[PDB]
Design a binder for this molecule. Structure first.
Ligand SMILES: Cc1ccc(C(=O)Nc2ccc(CN3CCN(C)CC3)c(C(F)(F)F)c2)cc1C#Cc1cnc2cccnn12
Ligand SMILES: [Cl-]
Ligand SMILES: [Cl-]
Ligand SMILES: [Cl-]
Ligand SMILES: [Cl-]
Length: 305
């Protein structure tokens, strides 16, 4: 599950350890068969005795030994990555005296996919009438900023030799100020009943976001994440539509991907952003751009707009 890094050899820094009893669990933010993410308040996180709201990831009583390893391995990965601007920020953890708890920041606006669909109908391509700024309409400027932030976050993950493997709008959190945080819901997502994940072998995988080498050879690299980022761009500029609309993942889908069929540009994608999508979807991973190159490309687009 780890292409390059070895989490078993990666230490869990004990500066992260947080007292279990100082958390007050609240509403459930998301849940899968074995794990869940809950909103919570932590008492002694901030130096002054003032409480702050956090999100906590934990396993359910249904979880087995495989999931207990995965949650601890996830904590080691998050601790190894450290805090970054474009990544959801680990705040602490609880590792003894009970089950593993992973504490991160709370992102007020939820996941990006639901945000795009919530904002889709009032989307504004050009400038917002200056009286209408209180409406906080979704604009093309916001979409470009989202692509830029996620590309920077993925560039940082690549620099840490880390492969995301499930990059999609559903795995992007959104905070105040239209700032995105890459995340991985993992076990806290009900992939069993999520139509975006597809039965393949004995796993359920996000096939429509996956590069061919990941589908057919189970190969995950920096450049297979780049492919997923291209699908994410299509999600973004279609305002939250499902990729390859109307095409179920079946034998014809695999042949069409293999033979070079690619999606058309979504209705709201600038031509230069669609140019990025096509290069991300190159059958040859070596011909695909790097995330660092994508950041440079998008940065020039934002300046010239
Ligand atoms: C409590 C919690 C715990 C953990 C994580 C989490 O995303 N962990 C994570 C695990 C791994 C990876 C990277 N790997 C991917 C796999 N890959 C094979 C290895 C590398 C990353 C990543 F960000 F770097 F991508 C993140 C998020 C939350 C949340 C939350 C939260 C905050 N506000 C809200 C509002 C609504 C809902 N949730 N929510
Ligand atoms: Cl546990
Ligand atoms: Cl990894
Ligand atoms: Cl916002
Ligand atoms: Cl074209």
């Amino acid at each position: 599950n780890y292409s390059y890094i070895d989490p078993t050899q990666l230490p869990y820094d004990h500066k992260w350890e947080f007292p279990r009893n100082r958390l007050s669990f609240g509403k459930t933010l998301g849940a899968g068969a074995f794990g869940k993410v809950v909103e919570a308040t932590a008492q002694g996180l901030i130096k002054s005795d003032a409480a702050m709201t956090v999100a906590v990831k934990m396993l359910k009583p249904s979880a087995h030994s495989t999931e207990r390893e995965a949650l601890m391995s996830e904590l080691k990965v998050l601790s190894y990555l450290g805090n970054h601007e474009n990544i959801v920020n680990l705040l602490g953890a609880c590792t003894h005296g009970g089950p593993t708890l992973v504490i991160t920041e709370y992102c007020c606006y939820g996941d990006l996919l639901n945000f795009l669909r919530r904002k889709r109908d009032e989307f504004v391509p050009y400038k917002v009438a200056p009286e209408d700024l209180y409406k906080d309409f979704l604009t093309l400027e916001h979409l470009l900023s989202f692509s830029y932030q996620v590309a920077k976050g993925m560039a940082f993950l690549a620099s840490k030799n880390c492969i995301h493997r499930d990059l999609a709008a559903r795995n992007i959190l959104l905070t105040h100020g239209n700032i995105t945080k890459i995340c991985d819901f993992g076990l806290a997502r009900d992939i069993k009943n999520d139509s975006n994940y597809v039965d393949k072998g004995n796993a359920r995988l996000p096939v429509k976001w996956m590069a061919p080498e990941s589908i057919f050879n189970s190969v995950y690299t920096f450049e297979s994440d780049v492919w997923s980022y291209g699908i994410f761009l299509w999600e973004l500029f279609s305002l939250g539509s499902s990729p390859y609309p109307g095409m179920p993942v079946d034998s014809k889908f695999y042949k069409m991907i293999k033979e070079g069929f690619r999606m058309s540009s979504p209705e709201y994608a600038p031509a230069e952003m669609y140019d990025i999508m096509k290069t991300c979807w190159d059958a040859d991973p070596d011909k695909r751009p790097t995330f660092k190159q994508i950041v440079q490309d998008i940065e020039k687009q934002i300046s010239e707009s």
